[PDB]
Structure 1
Amino acid sequence: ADRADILYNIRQTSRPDVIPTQRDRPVAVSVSLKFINILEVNEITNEVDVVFWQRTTWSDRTLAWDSSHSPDQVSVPISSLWVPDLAAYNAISKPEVLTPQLARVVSDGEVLYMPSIRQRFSCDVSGVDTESGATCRIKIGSWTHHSREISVDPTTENSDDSEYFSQYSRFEILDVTQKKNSVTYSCCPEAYEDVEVSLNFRKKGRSEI
């Protein structure tokens, strides 16, 4: 079959509001952040505008097909498949999606979605104009799916932090580290996993002593 088939058959088996739990185990969702820009820093309100590619991967076997005589990958609108309800806990604005909202689907069910998002956060901005720089931490995890339904882990990949960071930004990234956590709230006895991304950055062109 061709691509027109693959989409047709995907539109059938897929249920965008039904999380693809396999057997009985959380859907493993990987979240890796690639910072592109730092636009508005306010050391007085501790708020920063950030631009980043949120690489998100997970598997949905209800999507898998045979790619022997058909493409191994196709681009699909995210409104046509289940997507993790991730949220940035310390975000103070809705996530502004800058790119077309298409996901990449492989015939084995692996799914990739990597939007470029622009968002404002509440975090530690103090130190931004100092050698050590400021460290702003961003918490991302599912909003309604606890640890047994969704587990989030930082796609561990020793990659250059400023690999895609605009060379024209007033800031420079000193260092980015992705960590995994687990919070239990009052509503429920089960834990909610998340990933803390600590972005260490500072202003460029500071005077030397």
Structure 2
Amino acid sequence: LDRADILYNIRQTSRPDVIPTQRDRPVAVSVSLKFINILEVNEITNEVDVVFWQQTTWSDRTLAWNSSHSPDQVSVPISSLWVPDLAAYNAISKPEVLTPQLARVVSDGEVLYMPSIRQRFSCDVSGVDTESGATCRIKIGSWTHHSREISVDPTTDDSEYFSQYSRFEILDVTQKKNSVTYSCCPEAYEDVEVSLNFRKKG
């Protein structure tokens, strides 16, 4: 198989609408935010404008191929792949995807989608101008798939990719996993809560 054959096969047979659950197990989705920039902060409105790497990982075995004498990875448009229906619960603008919308697919069926995203959020901006800084929390989870269909899990220097030219600096980033039941649905929905501790530079 060359890349042309692999991509032809994926295009003809991937079902982008079909969640790739195996044996009534959930699809395990890894989520991790790498902050690139903090562009605007409003301590009165409690709004922030940030740019982050949304590093997203999952397995889809229907994509797998024998790579014994073949490329073991290809890049694939996400329009030809199933992708998890993740959303930030406290976002107040839609995600502005800054980068080409291609995922990397490994021959064992591992998919890695890592777009750079600019988005506005409602969160706690108090303390942004102090030693301890502000802590803005961002919840991301599957919009329509409960915990028996999609599980989300944090994977893991916090400023590695953070712009040195921002007016802000990152003090710390922590992630944590949540299982929430909402009074109107019987099942639990998982999210990752990302806490960004940052402050205005001096």
Q: TM-score range by the shorter chain?
A: over 0.9
Q: Deviations over 1:81-112 (max 9, x none)?
A: 10000000000000000000000000000000
- Give the Cα–Cα distance (whole angstroms) in 2 for the partners of residues 148 and 102 of structure 1: 27
- Give the Cα–Cα distance (whole angstroms) in 2 for the partners of residues 96 and 165 of structure 1: 18
The Cα of 1:24 is off from its aligned counterpart by 1.0
Runs of at least 5 residues in structure 2 that lack an aligned partner in the other structure: none
- Give the Cα–Cα distance (whole angstroms) in 2 for the partners of residues 93 and 110 of structure 1: 30
- Give the Cα–Cα distance (whole angstroms) in 2 for the partners of residues 165 and 146 of structure 1: 33
Runs of at least 5 residues in structure 1 that lack an aligned partner in the other structure: none
Q: Extract structure 1 runs of 4+ deviating beyond 6 A.
A: none
Q: Deviations over 1:34-90 (max 9, x none)?
A: 000000100000000010000000000000001112100000000001000000000
* Percent identical: 99
- Give the Cα–Cα distance (whole angstroms) in 2 for the partners of residues 57 and 88 of structure 1: 17
The Cα of 1:190 is off from its aligned counterpart by 0.4
Aligned length: 201
Q: Secondary structure at the match of 1:181?
A: strand
Once structures 1 and 2 are overlaid, which stretch shifts more, 66-75 or 116-125? Answer: 66-75
Q: Deviations over 1:116-142 (max 9, x none)?
A: 000000000010001100000000000
- Give the Cα–Cα distance (whole angstroms) in 1 for the partners of residues 71 and 84 of structure 2: 25
Q: TM-score, normalised by structure 1?
A: 0.95
The Cα of 1:188 is off from its aligned counterpart by 1.6
Q: Secondary structure at the match of 2:9?
A: helix
- Give the Cα–Cα distance (whole angstroms) in 2 for the partners of residues 186 and 149 of structure 1: 19
Matched, 1:168 2:158: no
Matched, 1:203 2:189: no
- Give the Cα–Cα distance (whole angstroms) in 1 for the partners of residues 179 and 93 of structure 2: 23
Q: TM-score, normalised by structure 2?
A: 0.98
Q: Secondary structure at the match of 1:199?
A: strand
Q: Secondary structure at the match of 1:7?
A: helix
Q: Secondary structure at the match of 1:62?
A: helix
- Give the Cα–Cα distance (whole angstroms) in 1 for the partners of residues 13 and 176 of structure 2: 34
Q: Secondary structure at the match of 2:7?
A: helix
The Cα of 1:185 is off from its aligned counterpart by 1.5
- Give the Cα–Cα distance (whole angstroms) in 1 for the partners of residues 93 and 152 of structure 2: 22
Once structures 1 and 2 are overlaid, which stretch shifts more, 86-95 or 64-73? Answer: 64-73
